[PDB]
Amino acid sequence: MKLMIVGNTGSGKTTLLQLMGIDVKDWPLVLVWDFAGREEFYSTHPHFMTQRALYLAVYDLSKGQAEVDAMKPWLFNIKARASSSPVILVGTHLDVSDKILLGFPAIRDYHFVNATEESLRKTII
Numbered sequence: 001m002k003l004m005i006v007g008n009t010g011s012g013k014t015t016l017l018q019l020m021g022i023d024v025k026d027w028p029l030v031l032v033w034d035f036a037g038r039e040e041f042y043s044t045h046p047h048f049m050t051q052r053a054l055y056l057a058v059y060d061l062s063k064g065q066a067e068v069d070a071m072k073p074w075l076f077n078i079k080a081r082a083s084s085s086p087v088i089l090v091g092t093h094l095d096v097s098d099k100i101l102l103g104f105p106a107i108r109d110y111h112f113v114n115a116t117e118e119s120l121r122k123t124i125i
C-alpha cells in the first residue's frame with residue numbers, strides 16, 4: 001500500500017521522510033511517493049496516468065519470439081487503462097540477436113534498436 005507525502009513546496013516533506021518532482025521510495029508491511037508540490041500531484045490524477053500517456057513498449061529482441069509474446073499482456077493492460085492510447089513497440093539488443101499483432105492499443109510504429117549507442121527519438125510524438 002502507498003504512502004503519499006503531499007503539501008506545497010517548502011513544507012518539509014522530503015526532510016520529514018527522518019522517518020526512515022516525484023520521488024518514489026520503498027520504506028522497510030513495507031510502504032512512499034514524495035511529491036515536490038501541487039503541480040506534481042495534479043499530474044498523477046488518474047485522468048493523466050491513463051489518458052495523457054504515450055507508451056514505449058520495450059522488449060529484448062534476443063530472447064526470441066516469446067518475448068514479443070510476454071508483451072501481449074502489457075499491450076492488453078495498456079488497453080484496459082485507456083483504449084485509444086498510443087504505443088510504440090521497441091525491440092532492443094539488435095547487436096546480440098540472430099510476431100508484430102496488427103484487443104490491442106493504437107500501435108503507432110515499431111523500431112529495432114541497439115539501445116547502447118547513438119544511431120526512434122523523433123518518432124516519439
Ligand SMILES: Nc1nc2c(ncn2[C@@H]2O[C@H](COP(=O)(O)OP(=O)(O)O)[C@@H](O)[C@H]2O)c(=O)[nH]1
Nearest residue numbers: 058060091092093094095096113114115116117
Ligand atoms: N548489447 C546491448 N545491451 C543492452 C541493450 N539494451 C540494454 N542492454 C544491456 O542490457 C541490460 C538491460 O538493462 P536495463 O537498461 O537496466 O534494463 P531495464 O530493466 O529494462 O531497465 C544492461 O546491462 C544494458 O547494458 C542493447 O540494445 N544492446
